[PDB]
């Protein structure tokens, strides 16, 4: 069997699932950006750009 640190090598000879994995990674990164912006908007105080 594959050791734990090699599990993702099953994608090496599978272009369709490599794309699927790259799609999933892209979804997670874009979701982080959306979640991060929402959290900042919930905490940002806009009342004083000076101090």
């Amino acid at each position: 069997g594959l050791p734990w640190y090699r599990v993702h090598t099953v994608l090496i000879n599978d272009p369709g699932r490599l794309i699927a994995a790259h799609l999933m990674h892209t979804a997670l990164v874009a979701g982080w950006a959306g979640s991060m912006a929402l959290y900042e908007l919930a905490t940002f105080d806009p009342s004083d750009p000076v101090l």
Binding site: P46, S47, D48, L51
Partner: protein
């Protein structure tokens, strides 16, 4: 040609004060021996500004715009009272009665709601 309630209901005109033609640039004579009243005073707000409250009291505060969130419920109307002729020729209006207040909520940028009793009571 005179408008009725059913011509007006739901239009928003009920919250608007009357206007006068552009030809209305005359003069109404005051006889210091006659008594007068205001039979109807109407006040239609078009802008609500709220003074911002700054952290440093050296900085001069300004009036910022707001968004009205309580709809077309803002005008004072049917206000009446005595219109006195003073000995120096000035006129003094003394409000006695009418729909002379409206609760109003406006909203600042950022969401803070400002309720006020928009009024000319007394």
């Amino acid at each position: 040609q005179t408008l009725t309630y059913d011509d007006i209901v739901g239009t928003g005109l009920a919250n608007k004060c009357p206007t006068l033609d552009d030809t209305a640039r005359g003069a109404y004579p005051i006889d210091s021996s006659q008594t007068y009243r205001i039979a109807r005073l109407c006040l239609q707000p078009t802008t609500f500004l709220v003074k911002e409250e700054p952290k440093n009291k050296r900085q001069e505060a300004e009036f910022v715009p707001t968004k009205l969130v309580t709809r077309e419920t803002t005008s004072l109307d049917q206000i009446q009272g005595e219109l006195k002729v003073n000995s120096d020729g000035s006129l003094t209006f003394v409000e006695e009665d009418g729909i002379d207040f409206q609760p109003v909520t406006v909203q600042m940028a950022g969401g803070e709601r400002i309720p006020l009793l928009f009024t000319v009571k007394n």
